[model samples]
Target: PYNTNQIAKWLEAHAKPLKTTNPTASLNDLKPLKNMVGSASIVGLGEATHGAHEVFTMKHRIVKYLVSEKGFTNLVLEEGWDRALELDRYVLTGKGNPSQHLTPVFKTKEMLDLLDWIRQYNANPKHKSKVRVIGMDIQSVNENVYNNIIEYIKANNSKLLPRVEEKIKGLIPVTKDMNTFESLTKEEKEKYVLDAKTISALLEENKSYLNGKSKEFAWIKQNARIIEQFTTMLATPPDKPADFYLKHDIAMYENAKWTEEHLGKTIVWGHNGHVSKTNMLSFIYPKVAGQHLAEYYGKRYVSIGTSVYEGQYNVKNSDGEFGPYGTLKSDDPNSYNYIFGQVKKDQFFIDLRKANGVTKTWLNEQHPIFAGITTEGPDIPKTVDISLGKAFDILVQIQKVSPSQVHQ
Candidate 1:
């Protein structure tokens, strides 16, 4: 058995205790993260559970730290491109309603607070580079994506609008809804795919006319590309689940990379599953988006994984009842939650990169940890075995958490 006394003692020496979960709090306790973040071009901030108030607020605090201290510019989330455009506009300017546009899964007060903070931060006259938002997911498209292309075509080549409008008509009913998109016949789907490709080709054929304008509006084409990516993602055979997930993961990485190339440093805000370097659920998906990023960016891609000892969080049960629920203790004694709890900190983070000797060895070995809690299920944290040291560079452990104020 591992010595809890020695391990807890070791942890006490290493853990960087957080002063508060408030995003508006002073950054004094967060100084250690400066050394950890270093010159990383991209940082993936992961959440263990989806709906913890403390975790959600803490992430907003980290985003502030990254923006104010590290000169990071992009806030990439696990959301759809078309939907995130509204929030991005809201961040850069004082227009658009965030509540109406936030991804349905993230309709939480905590998330809206962060968007408000981002908008407030941008309003500062002293801040030179305003932070931008990007969505790396491709499960669905919307009118915003259509408008992006239509706006481009109208300004540059008005003649194509008729054909573009026709193509858009064919696309909107399917692309706007995931379930409806899946209900298409093989031939019907192929025709829609051709329409998207036709729009892409039109953009390419008019490159000479759309050069300097397109240079400033490269996102129009990138937005167009996502429609193609969405179709490709849908077409992936469900029988080959790995390929399906790989397509999605690769799309996410590409979007992240695109943001990095266009807009300085980026912070990827997503779940622990996709942000972890090793796919926590290897039985289902291939290497995660973070792993793809790690491969491309090497040490410049840093991932911070969050966890908690015990907490109360929101969950929607099988019967469709949703509310705050307390966590059950893990049957596995070797759980990282239990081991880290031995440290006795209210909220703290350990730099796994700085781990050495016995601590280092302990990190390298697999241990039971909360992967995530199911939404359509009970409050028990899903336990999974993985070497967290390999999955994340830093671990933020909160002693306890309460449910986030989810938007109804």
Candidate 2:
């Protein structure tokens, strides 16, 4: 067992203490992060849990700082690609009603506010680089993405419509539940493989038309590929959930990489598991999105892992009822999160890169904490090293936290 007092003492010595948790805090107040951010192209902001108000608000605050102070121009989320694109257009051009396009999964007040702020920023003519909101996840089949591809085919190359229509028609029925591929007949699986090949060829065939339609073409091609990837995953046996998730993670990493290349710099928002430089949940799922990103970007990728001391938060129980009505169960006194709580600060940012002495040693050791979406009870945090310093460049901790306001 580790000494709680010693852990607290080390935190007191090294952690960069934050004076407030004010949502209205200015960039000047977040000046400490400027040094920690360095010259990173992709800054990953992770939350310990999806249902915490403090985590959401804190990240939103950081995003504002990055946009106003730093030159980061993209905000990539762990959400469906087309869904976020809808939000992106709404923010950048006020193209459509955001309420209709926003995914119900993220019906949080902080999320809505973030979107509103982005729209407000874009409205200002003085800001040259308008922040783009992009999504990296490939799970959901965005019908708009598919329809765009069909429309592109119709406008540019009517001759290929019949062939494209035949292949894409198969996807329409299964688009809502891509997981149903496992139950399909063998003949249907073969048809899907052929359809993927056909769509891929069409993408190549219509490259000339894609010249002026860069944004539209990229997503259409990417979404078609997403269908192919999902079909491939679903065609695999049901027992290999690992295979499915690994494919998903790789797709997420590739999408995030594309977003970075397209926007120069981006801020990635997601669960701590998806944003860590190393695999944080290897015992369950080995291949994580950030692990791939870290390998690809090296020091250009910076991740900030977030945590909290104690308070209530939202969670869907085993009954699957989502509610902002649960206590933040106190962690094991010996766990790393517990150690972080020992620090004498209401909120703080800890630079793991600057870790030294006993703190460094403790960091390298296995320290447990809850970092999942839901909690039905006081589950013990998973005790895994995940190479803390290697996994995250920095850590943001709040001494107290509360449940986020749920959308539905």
Candidate 3:
């Protein structure tokens, strides 16, 4: 699988012919992968740790390509755009929000390039028509509308700790009383209780918070309303790590409702997990039509993986075996090694998706690494297909299958 280097060399060899006389060329004619697409939703699927290398740098890289090459007019971040609207507005207007104390952190040089490019694009009349950065975060219409839900929650509900404690207490009695035959057996008692109490507590806790009539309350309420409409919301946690998908959908919904919706497309930046399956390899398209919330508002979808140029290979373990490249070193024989290669079509990179966040769902059963891989899009006939040999070799480093032995 390590052949991407040769593939890159191949594309570099063909860049000229593809751009010259023929718009339609074969694999030998394809230019840089960056030159092929006009829009993408780059998802960060790795390394977001305690100020570790897990920073969201890939987010910046994808954004940079969108502005500098693709001339993409819009950007959607996993950080619910509502929370970063100030930055969104700045990107659109070419000005910072003086009222907002801190600007959204663009931690990488790639991000700096993206912000600057958007600002420049918006400032110029020629590019202004194509510039727009919309926050696709799940939105909450507060009673006051004077402040955001999180900010209001922070200022007013800092005492949520005790409230959470009370909820756990309320659910424990019911869970402990569950009979073994009717519920999780004694062998799985602790694990079962942990899962049950936690979710019940969060739901109960969030419900009480909503009763306060605060913006945070309304936000949770909004989430509940939508879930109630679904087959079941709590039947599965809306996969918060992949919430960026929902955020983008929300943007589509809102934009479509606007009086004069503008722009040809909206590009999203997120991790592969949001676009890929939970195991982190296969690409699963969003189900439920009008459910692509952002589309409801008027946004065309373009999903881009965070590691557009990086390929995830297998790393070895103590048994001298291989496994998928994840946050923690592993021994899963089927895992791939991660390769952070230079820009290439088949060379997929690892982007950080869900860093450290509190997950109360049972589905997040294991520490999942949302990594990705890329192949040349068939539409781009001349695109190169990179190799995964080296990456697979790396996975040989960790060969254990079950995560059970991981910690031990």
Winning candidate number (lDDT): 1
Best by TM-score: 1
In order of lDDT, best first, we have 1, 2, 3
Candidate 3 structure quality by residue, lDDT tens digits, 1-408: 234344334333332221211111233322243433423332112222111121233334444445545555555554433334566567667667422412222233334445665666677776435555544333321122123332444455555545334333333333322142124433444443344345334545665554654444544433322222111211223345344334334343443222123343445444333322222322332331133422332223333332222223333334544343323332321222222222233322221221122211211233223232221233322111222221111100111121111110
**Taking the tens digit of each residue's C-alpha lDDT, what string does model 2 give over 354-402?**
8777677777766666655554544523344556777788999887888
Residue 177 error for model 3, in Å? 33
Instruction: Identify the superior model by lDDT, candidate 1 or candidate 3.
Output: 1
- lDDT of the candidates, in the order given: 0.83, 0.78, 0.33
Candidate 2 has an lDDT of 0.78
Judged by lDDT against the true structure, how good is candidate 3?
A: 0.33
TM-score of each: 0.94, 0.91, 0.38
RMSD of each: 2.1, 2.6, 15.8
Q: Give the Cα error of residue 201 in candidate 1, in Å.
A: 2.9
- Model 1 C-alpha lDDT per residue in residues 291-404, reported as the tens digit of each score: 899889989999999988776787666676556754646555577888887777789998998887677788888888876654644444467788978999999988888988
